Design a protein around this ligand. Sequence first.
Ligand SMILES: Cc1ncsc1-c1ccc(CNC(=O)[C@@H]2C[C@@H](O)CN2C(=O)[C@@H](c2cc(OCCCCN3CCCN(c4nccc(-c5noc([C@@]6(C)CCCc7sc(N)c(C#N)c76)n5)n4)[C@@H](C)C3)no2)C(C)C)cc1
Ligand SMILES: Nc1nc2c(ncn2[C@@H]2O[C@H](COP(=O)(O)OP(=O)(O)CP(=O)(O)O)[C@@H](O)[C@H]2O)c(=O)[nH]1
Ligand SMILES: [Mg+2]
Lengths: 90, 148, 104, 159
Amino acid sequence: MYVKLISSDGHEFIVKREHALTSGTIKAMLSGPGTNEVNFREIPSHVLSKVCMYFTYKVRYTNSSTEIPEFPIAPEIALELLMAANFLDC
Amino acid sequence: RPVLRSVNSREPSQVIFCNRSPRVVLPVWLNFDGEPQPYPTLPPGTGRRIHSYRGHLWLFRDAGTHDGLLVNQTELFVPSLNVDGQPIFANITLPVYTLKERCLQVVRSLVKPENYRRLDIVRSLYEDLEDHPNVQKDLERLTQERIA
Amino acid sequence: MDVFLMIRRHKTTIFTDAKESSTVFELKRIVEGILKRPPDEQRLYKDDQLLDDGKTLGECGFTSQTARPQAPATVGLAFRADDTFEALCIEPFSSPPELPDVMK
Amino acid sequence: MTEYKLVVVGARGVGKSALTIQLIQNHFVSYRKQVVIDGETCLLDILDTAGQEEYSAMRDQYMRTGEGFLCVFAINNTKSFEDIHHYREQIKRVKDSEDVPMVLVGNKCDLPSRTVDTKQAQDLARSYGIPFIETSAKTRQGVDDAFYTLVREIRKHKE
Ligand SMILES: Cc1ncsc1-c1ccc(CNC(=O)[C@@H]2C[C@@H](O)CN2C(=O)[C@@H](c2cc(OCCCCN3CCCN(c4nccc(-c5noc([C@@]6(C)CCCc7sc(N)c(C#N)c76)n5)n4)[C@@H](C)C3)no2)C(C)C)cc1
Ligand SMILES: Nc1nc2c(ncn2[C@@H]2O[C@H](COP(=O)(O)OP(=O)(O)CP(=O)(O)O)[C@@H](O)[C@H]2O)c(=O)[nH]1
Ligand SMILES: [Mg+2]
């Protein structure tokens, strides 16, 4: 089962639902105590893509036992991704 | 006596410190008083046959930024006793950092602490940038987490 | 060994994974389970070259060293409306602003 | 004139003091001596010959000032050779580096009760990447070579 994450400029991101829930914010907008897509009005596509890459990164290398690589963040995207990560609680 | 402290077992145990992180790793030994004591740095990809003792507590941080690291996928490492003299292996790895904390690291390395307040970010992120990783802070957390 | 991919068509991007030993047809099967389009109507591309449905992902160049989860490899996607085949077009992502002087 | 601060280390009774006394006064029963080693006149200063065990922050700060180390064991005593590892590792700890000028020294080669074969020590020294010299504090044999070699290994470590 998958979920669509829409950026500010209309870029659509189909990512595994379990991967999107790694962020407390997305987890709260879909699974409350009681919903197939969510629109992010202030996150450009070049940031939401990196966030999805973090999702699959978080999901895969959590259960890893031998060695984990660094998650690279380019300097030009650093601030825009920091705002998003703080906003998304991931 | 604190809980996060080494034990005076006086029983040596040969250990292999393995830096499988892209960081220069600072091995930190918690002495018998719980005081973090620094040990020689490990370049990325380095392995050293180390001489420790049974019951001695260790943790590992980035030598430059003091970022938290994992050793055998746990925050702390205690060597058992060598069975038939074979060494115990310590596998220092990167954590799966939060995307926020990893972002903090990247900007801390790019901006000097004086220029933190010269960015278009929210004010809450200013104090989050200034809250640099500190070993004493983590030890207080890991002590309170041992309330089992 | 797994490989992590970004299947992209127009402004849509799919984050999925598969094994190096898996073939392109099996990837087309996963795209059918998401976008509800038959694999016969699917055409997967590495950059600009068409991928053979019988060749495994590793055989196309998607090794674990090139399709990492923190840096996936990009696969193009083009559909076929009946006997009419569309042109592969992947609308690029947005651009980041120039890095502030405080970081140079 | 450059000065080289040397520390003699080893198990109890291996002959650390005897070696240094043999080095300075050429006699067998403050440690400074001017000497010419490889055309450069220097001053050797032996920092410690006492084998007692003391992990005080003051002794650490004292050993940290030493530039070279003579790791000494007696070939008449097997455990003195086995403990060499521990002394070597403690040197790495105080110096905060994996590569520190060091020389493995086997003392009491005049005694006829050898229990540690010479082949063992050269193999241990070859694994440590440091020179190995057999010495005798009673017969002056190798004493000069052992200290001068350490001075040579100190000059080699300064790139
Ligand atoms: C390279 C590298 N890269 C990344 S990490 C790394 C690395 C580098 C070095 C090491 C070394 N390992 C450690 O630091 C381990 C790790 C952790 O577990 C705590 N720890 C410890 O050693 C701690 C410890 C000891 C312990 O029980 C101790 C039980 C030992 C029992 N004894 C009794 C038998 C004889 N005998 C002995 N008899 C007399 C004298 C000596 C001696 N020995 O040296 C030195 C000299 C004079 C010579 C060298 C320079 C310095 S300086 C300093 N103060 C010195 C002194 N007195 C020295 N004389 N020995 C030993 C073989 C065994 N319980 O905790 C110490 C620090 C209090 C570990 C890792
Ligand atoms: N036959 C012989 N005896 C030696 C030799 N070197 C040292 N000794 C003897 O070993 C004993 C201990 O050596 P000494 O230098 O006095 O002590 P040390 O190793 O400094 C002892 P500590 O570690 O307690 O300071 C002495 O009785 C000394 O005569 C040697 O080359 N030959
Ligand atoms: Mg003495």
